[PDB]
Design a binder for this molecule. Structure first.
Ligand SMILES: Nc1nc2nc(S)n(CCO)c2c(=O)[nH]1
Length: 160
């Protein structure tokens, strides 16, 4: 029951993107061991990786959690599988990504999981919305607080 403060990164680029983010937050907070305590603004971001796909909506969430980072990962995975289910086949699959960004001030390096991801520092679609809710949290790989990692990126803009 020692509570860890974690940050998650959420994204959806196809379907009702905002409603997808919204549901993921709700589902995560429904776990006995997770309490959603803050949410960033939503940002519309240009796709990173494949450039030929729709824009994402991204946000980040602060949680107070008594789960271990792997149990938290489980909750993330279950939430993805759940909001991926088709609504109507002809509409196609729905989308949602939920990543653990920060878990207390710990560096976690397991074969199935790295928290923070070592390349998270590259991602404005993460850092910008992260900075709205975790500006003063130290990202342990770099040793920089999130407010000092965040950089200018015009491909990321507030959505509402
Ligand atoms: N802008 C942006 N690009 C992305 N590429 C992938 S893959 N993803 C899914 C997150 O890993 C995203 C994303 O959430 N936002």
């Amino acid at each position: 029951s020692h509570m860890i403060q974690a940050y998650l990164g959420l994204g959806s680029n196809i379907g009702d993107r905002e409603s997808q983010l919204n549901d993921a937050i709700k589902i995560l907070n429904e776990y006995d061991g997770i309490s959603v305590s803050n949410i960033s603004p939503i940002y519309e971001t240009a796709p990173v990786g494949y450039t030929e796909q729709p824009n994402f909506l991204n946000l980040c969430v602060e949680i107070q959690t008594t789960l271990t980072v792997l149990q938290l990962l489980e909750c993330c995975l279950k939430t993805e599988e759940c909001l991926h289910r088709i609504r109507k086949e002809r509409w196609g699959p729905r989308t949602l990504d939920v990543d653990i960004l920060l878990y207390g001030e710990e560096m976690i390096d397991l074969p199935k999981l790295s928290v923070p991801h070592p390349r998270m520092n590259e991602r404005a679609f993460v850092l910008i919305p992260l900075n709205d809710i975790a500006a003063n949290v130290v990202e342990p790989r770099s040793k920089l607080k999130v407010k000092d990692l965040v950089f200018v990126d015009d491909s990321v803009k507030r959505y509402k």
